[PDB]
Design a protein around this ligand. Structure first.
Ligand code: J1E
Length: 138
């Protein structure tokens, strides 16, 4: 494969028990990946693996409101590797997004944007070959 950046519409927004699955492969020498769950111009949930921030690998999560980034939430557990295939699963739960990578729980992100049914796009960006992006209800 899909063209990156990729826009996946989420019809009617998100809702608890919606599971979003992203399959791809990290490029060689990757620097960054981003998933952006968007409410119009706002980013309800930005999930941003950084492969070289001051020579460290870190996951940064944040929200962008009225074009302003908020307070970052950081996770140093880092399950991605340059050149390797991955699966990201984002399960919407009542009070947070729950993220697993390669079937292992990674992090939760509490809902800052609370109009879940207005979070109606997922952008997928950065240093990946994107194989598929889809959603289902569990
Ligand atoms: O906030 C999140 C934002 O970050 C900024 S970079 C600056 C901050 O990182 C500053 N900062 C440090 C800290 C902090 C807090 C505690 C400890 C600590 F060490 C540090 N708190 N704030 C970044 O451009 C943003 N962005 C990334 C992308 C993007 C586009 C395409 C592909 C892709 F993969 C990503 N588009 N926009 C977005 O990721």
């Amino acid at each position: 494969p899909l063209i990156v950046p990729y826009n996946l519409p989420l019809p009617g927004g998100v809702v608890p028990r919606m599971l979003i699955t992203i399959l791809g492969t990290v490029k060689p020498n990757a620097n960054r990946i981003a998933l952006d769950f968007q409410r119009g111009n706002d980013v309800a949930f930005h999930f941003n693996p950084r492969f070289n921030e001051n020579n460290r690998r870190v996951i940064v999560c944040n929200t962008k409101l009225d074009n302003n980034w908020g307070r970052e939430e950081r996770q140093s557990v880092f399950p991605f590797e340059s050149g390797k295939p991955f699966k990201i699963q984002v399960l919407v739960e009542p009070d947070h997004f729950k993220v697993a990578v390669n079937d292992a729980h990674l992090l939760q992100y509490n809902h800052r944007v609370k109009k879940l049914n207005e979070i109606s796009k997922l952008g997928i960006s950065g240093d990946i070959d994107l194989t598929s992006a889809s959603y289902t209800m569990i």
